[PDB]
Design a protein around this ligand. Structure first.
Ligand SMILES: Nc1ncnc2c1ncn2[C@@H]1O[C@@H]2COP(=O)(O)O[C@H]2[C@H]1O
Ligand SMILES: Nc1ncnc2c1ncn2[C@@H]1O[C@@H]2COP(=O)(O)O[C@H]2[C@H]1O
Ligand SMILES: Nc1ncnc2c1ncn2[C@@H]1O[C@@H]2COP(=O)(O)O[C@H]2[C@H]1O
Ligand SMILES: Nc1ncnc2c1ncn2[C@@H]1O[C@@H]2COP(=O)(O)O[C@H]2[C@H]1O
Lengths: 202, 201
């Protein structure tokens, strides 16, 4: 098994949250670090009109609220809401700074996740800068197809995903998502089989 | 004037890069960490057609090429180009991982810069998703006029930047930048005094 996590978790409080609950309130003062024992979450930023953007999906095995760890007086950089019911560990920054001196691997794992997040977020900047809505929705589909949650299909990878949520990822209305998907079918690039979406040539 | 940082540099091998040189190409196998002693660099990504986007500006006191540190077999995720002449400290991941075990403070310092970079890059995501090109150019000029290299001017603040570099930051053609600037002058919000730009306010 993993003694390091075990060791890490023995210094945490664990708490459970129902689906759709807000784990992190943007703007708040950061003093605590979190680790997802079970579940999945969305990280998201808002427009001044209430519009929500989904930055990132995090799951079992992810730290959360780590960005304020390295400087005192930081505030949460974004919102995090419980995608499913979650089981979440919690430890203060101070205590977590102490664990680091005993075993820096826990910091390595955390920074490993920051590095990954930075790479992917950077790619998202690129999509936003270089691609129109159509292009962005295509890359979004290709990426979801590459996920392990992607069911295998004769014609390609099969994903299940809401239009609304596709909109929150690329930054457009769900109506716009729908019209674009319908065009991608016509172009014979995907299929919209009721619930799922089959991404051809994946 | 910093015990840990010197301690860190003492293990580094220094290299100098002339302006406009590329320290890191995207795709390379990551096996080295960098630290900027002097100078400034641009981190950027290219598009399949060659269009360039500036992700971040890094300066004296910034690690570079740290994203490949935590997993092996990784590849450099972007290009880093010398914006000026640079004095850069360098060290292998292998030897760097040992510095961590000896003193994890050096990791905390590294990780602290990574944290900031994620916040600012997520902010950029917001910028691009919620603001039209006009919006982004305005915001950009403001941010530039709040810089320390922002010379002072009686009408406001003055900055020196090309339209090319403005489009690389906000993601538009240099012909788009020009057109938007003309409009900002029309609104008496800036002045195109040749090379430089006066930002009223
Ligand atoms: N671009 C991103 N990719 C992944 N996780 C993010 C991103 N932006 C913010 N987060 C997470 O959102 C959390 C909310 O507040 P913190 O800044 O405390 O810590 C944050 C990060 O863990
Ligand atoms: N630039 C944008 N234009 C429209 N909706 C956006 C934008 N950026 C983010 N969104 C969000 O994306 C969501 C997708 O579908 P909704 O109609 O539910 O509501 C949408 C908005 O909240
Ligand atoms: N969004 C970003 N903000 C700051 N620095 C970045 C960003 N994206 C990439 N870099 C730097 O670009 C470097 C090039 O390759 P690495 O992945 O080795 O390490 C990278 C980071 O140091
Ligand atoms: N979406 C974009 N459209 C056009 N140029 C872009 C875009 N995103 C980044 N760029 C870059 O921005 C640069 C600014 O001026 P150029 O026309 O010289 O070349 C441009 C491109 O390399």
């Amino acid at each position: 098994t993993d003694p390091t996590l075990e060791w890490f978790l023995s210094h945490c409080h664990i708490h459970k949250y129902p689906s759709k609950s807000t784990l992190i309130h943007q703007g708040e003062k950061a003093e605590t670090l979190y680790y997802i024992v079970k579940g999945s979450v969305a990280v998201l930023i808002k427009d001044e009109e209430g519009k929500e953007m989904i930055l990132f999906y995090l799951n079992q095995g992810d730290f959360i609220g780590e960005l304020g760890l390295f400087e005192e007086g930081q505030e949460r950089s974004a919102w995090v809401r419980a995608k499913t019911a979650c089981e979440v560990a919690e430890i203060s920054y101070k205590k977590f700074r102490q664990l680091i001196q005993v075993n820096p691997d826990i910091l390595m794992r955390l920074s490993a996740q920051m590095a990954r997040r930075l790479q992917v977020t950077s790619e998202k900047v690129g999509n936003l800068a270089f691609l129109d809505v159509t292009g962005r929705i295509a890359q979004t589909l290709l990426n979801l197809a590459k996920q392990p949650d992607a069911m295998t299909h004769p014609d390609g990878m099969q994903i299940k995903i809401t239009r609304q949520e596709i909109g929150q990822i690329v930054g457009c209305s769900r109506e716009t998502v729908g019209r674009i998907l319908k065009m991608l079918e016509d172009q014979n690039l995907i299929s919209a089989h009721g619930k799922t979406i089959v991404v051809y040539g994946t």
